[PDB]
Scaffold this active site. Structure first.
Site, mmCIF file in Angstrom:
data_model
loop_
_atom_site.group_PDB
_atom_site.id
_atom_site.type_symbol
_atom_site.label_atom_id
_atom_site.label_comp_id
_atom_site.label_asym_id
_atom_site.label_seq_id
_atom_site.Cartn_x
_atom_site.Cartn_y
_atom_site.Cartn_z
ATOM 1 N NE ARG A 45 -4.247 1.848 1.675
ATOM 2 C CZ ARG A 45 -4.938 2.744 2.385
ATOM 3 N NH1 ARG A 45 -4.508 3.205 3.541
ATOM 4 N NH2 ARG A 45 -6.092 3.163 1.849
ATOM 5 C CG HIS A 49 -1.827 5.297 -0.512
ATOM 6 N ND1 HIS A 49 -2.539 5.717 0.578
ATOM 7 C CD2 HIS A 49 -2.724 4.629 -1.266
ATOM 8 C CE1 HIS A 49 -3.797 5.325 0.528
ATOM 9 N NE2 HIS A 49 -3.944 4.662 -0.599
ATOM 10 C CD1 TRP A 188 -11.465 -6.387 0.445
ATOM 11 C CD2 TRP A 188 -9.558 -6.127 1.545
ATOM 12 N NE1 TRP A 188 -11.240 -5.052 0.534
ATOM 13 C CE2 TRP A 188 -10.067 -4.852 1.207
ATOM 14 C CE3 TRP A 188 -8.350 -6.212 2.246
ATOM 15 C CZ2 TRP A 188 -9.423 -3.674 1.544
ATOM 16 C CZ3 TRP A 188 -7.695 -5.027 2.575
ATOM 17 C CH2 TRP A 188 -8.219 -3.766 2.229
HETATM 18 C C1 HEM Z 1 -10.639 2.760 -5.582
HETATM 19 C C2 HEM Z 1 -9.331 2.463 -5.107
HETATM 20 C C3 HEM Z 1 -8.994 2.052 -3.774
HETATM 21 C C4 HEM Z 1 -9.585 2.391 -2.607
HETATM 22 C C5 HEM Z 1 -10.758 3.298 -2.329
HETATM 23 C C6 HEM Z 1 -8.854 1.744 -1.563
HETATM 24 C C7 HEM Z 1 -9.136 1.808 -0.216
HETATM 25 C C8 HEM Z 1 -8.498 1.102 0.803
HETATM 26 C C9 HEM Z 1 -8.837 1.223 2.198
HETATM 27 C C10 HEM Z 1 -9.939 2.064 2.812
HETATM 28 C C11 HEM Z 1 -7.921 0.425 2.834
HETATM 29 C C12 HEM Z 1 -7.866 0.098 4.305
HETATM 30 C C13 HEM Z 1 -6.824 1.003 4.985
HETATM 31 C C14 HEM Z 1 -6.803 0.605 6.449
HETATM 32 O O1 HEM Z 1 -7.827 0.747 7.186
HETATM 33 O O2 HEM Z 1 -5.728 0.120 6.876
HETATM 34 C C15 HEM Z 1 -7.060 -0.193 1.882
HETATM 35 C C16 HEM Z 1 -6.076 -1.098 2.188
HETATM 36 C C17 HEM Z 1 -5.180 -1.598 1.227
HETATM 37 N N1 HEM Z 1 -5.144 -1.236 -0.105
HETATM 38 FE FE1 HEM Z 1 -6.429 -0.093 -1.089
HETATM 39 N N2 HEM Z 1 -7.790 1.014 -2.094
HETATM 40 C C18 HEM Z 1 -7.840 1.207 -3.456
HETATM 41 C C19 HEM Z 1 -6.913 0.753 -4.373
HETATM 42 C C20 HEM Z 1 -5.766 0.005 -4.063
HETATM 43 C C21 HEM Z 1 -4.728 -0.319 -5.011
HETATM 44 C C22 HEM Z 1 -4.763 0.204 -6.431
HETATM 45 C C23 HEM Z 1 -3.786 -1.031 -4.324
HETATM 46 C C24 HEM Z 1 -2.488 -1.496 -4.750
HETATM 47 C C25 HEM Z 1 -2.251 -2.063 -6.005
HETATM 48 C C26 HEM Z 1 -4.241 -1.149 -2.962
HETATM 49 C C27 HEM Z 1 -3.606 -1.852 -1.957
HETATM 50 C C28 HEM Z 1 -4.053 -1.937 -0.621
HETATM 51 C C29 HEM Z 1 -3.480 -2.806 0.395
HETATM 52 C C30 HEM Z 1 -2.344 -3.750 0.083
HETATM 53 C C31 HEM Z 1 -4.186 -2.603 1.535
HETATM 54 C C32 HEM Z 1 -4.020 -3.260 2.886
HETATM 55 C C33 HEM Z 1 -3.109 -2.415 3.768
HETATM 56 C C34 HEM Z 1 -2.847 -3.020 5.133
HETATM 57 O O3 HEM Z 1 -3.253 -4.166 5.446
HETATM 58 O O4 HEM Z 1 -2.178 -2.324 5.965
HETATM 59 N N3 HEM Z 1 -5.465 -0.475 -2.796
HETATM 60 N N4 HEM Z 1 -7.412 0.253 0.614
#
Ligand code: HEM
EC number: 1.11.1.5
Length: 291
Positions: A45, A49, A188
């Protein structure tokens, strides 16, 4: 503005494989983080970001400048929790002070995907740190409470098409949402520190219910204890996204290949690679090296 990749002086593939390896060894060692999820997901992430602030219209933001290191960006509410990935990388940067910040943040993501048994992601060096005033303002990363039209329009700014968006979203197999971070809670799926196409399978095959979480936000929840954000769920509400979701749910290799391309692209938006730059590097995993 043009951001030309500039190879860290005198460095070559072996230098960066050493950085890879140090990241990979710390990923293995520091296994307790996040209830034993480990740092893989948050490093993925972080890479996204730090890249996803890019605006194709004027080449602001993007991975090149490594601007997350400045307080405006590390304190973006959208980046809540990523400080854990940054702290992870700190000893890496201390050991290898020659690597640029952008190169380290993006390499962390590559290394995490690969060490989690994901596809190989070709990676190019040459990001150069840029000054504090080049840090993009907050608000360029996406909202999670929105629909497919939002998602599609959002990602046009990163020059991603429908296939690239659906592929990139497969990274939500990894890690979890954390209520205090994003206002969403739950993983997820089951395999959340092994890179697989589970995100798509769960979207199609779980029985999802629209519920409110304890932060009063709506999310989709299953009896297995999994969740989907509204933007994740939008991928099966929109018939164009749905087709692609089904493709990746039914072809792991295709998902790997398309993810690899899209993720490299994400990490490289905004960078101009000279004609005589090195070819992209494909790092060996620790396992492939016998380490
Ligand atoms: C419409 C696009 C996206 C939205 C709205 C979104 C939103 C989110 C949200 C709300 C979280 C949870 C953050 C938390 O509470 O720790 C998250 C986690 C994450 N996202 Fe996204 N995301 C998007 C696209 C992506 C993309 C493009 C990637 C990378 C290719 C990505 C990789 C991740 C990963 C790996 C996590 C888990 C982080 C953790 O466990 O600490 N996301 N995302």
């Amino acid at each position: 503005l043009v951001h030309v990749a500039s190879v860290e002086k005198g460095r070559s593939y072996e230098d960066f494989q050493k950085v890879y390896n140090a990241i990979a060894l710390k990923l293995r060692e520091d296994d307790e983080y996040d209830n034993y999820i480990g740092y893989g997901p948050v490093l993925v992430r972080l890479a996204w970001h730090t890249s996803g602030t890019w605006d194709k219209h004027d080449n602001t933001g993007g991975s090149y400048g490594g601007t997350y290191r400045f307080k405006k960006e590390f304190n973006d509410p959208s980046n809540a929790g990523l400080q854990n990935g940054f702290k992870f990388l700190e000893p890496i940067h201390k050991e290898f002070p020659w690597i640029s910040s952008g190169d380290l943040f993006s390499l962390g993501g590559v290394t995490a995907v690969q060490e989690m048994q994901g596809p190989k992601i070709p990676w190019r060096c040459g990001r150069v740190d840029t000054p504090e005033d080049t840090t993009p303002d907050n608000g360029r990363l996406p909202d999670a409470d929105k629909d497919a039209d939002y998602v599609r329009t959002f990602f046009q700014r990163l020059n991603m098409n429908d296939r690239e968006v659906v592929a990139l979203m497969g990274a939500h197999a990894l890690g979890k949402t954390h209520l205090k971070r994003s206002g969403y809670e739950g993983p997820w799926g089951a395999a959340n520190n092994v890179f697989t196409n589970e995100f798509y399978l769960n979207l199609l095959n779980e029985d999802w219910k629209l519920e409110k979480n304890d932060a009063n936000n709506e999310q989709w929840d299953s009896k297995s204890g999994y969740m989907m954000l509204p933007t994740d769920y939008s991928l099966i509400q929109d018939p164009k996204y749905l087709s692609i979701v089904k493709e990746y749910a039914n072809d792991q290799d295709k998902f790997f290949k398309d993810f690899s391309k899209a993720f490299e692209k994400l990490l490289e938006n905004g960078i101009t690679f000279p004609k005589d730059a090195p070819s992209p590097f494909i790092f060996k995993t620790l396992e492939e090296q016998g380490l």
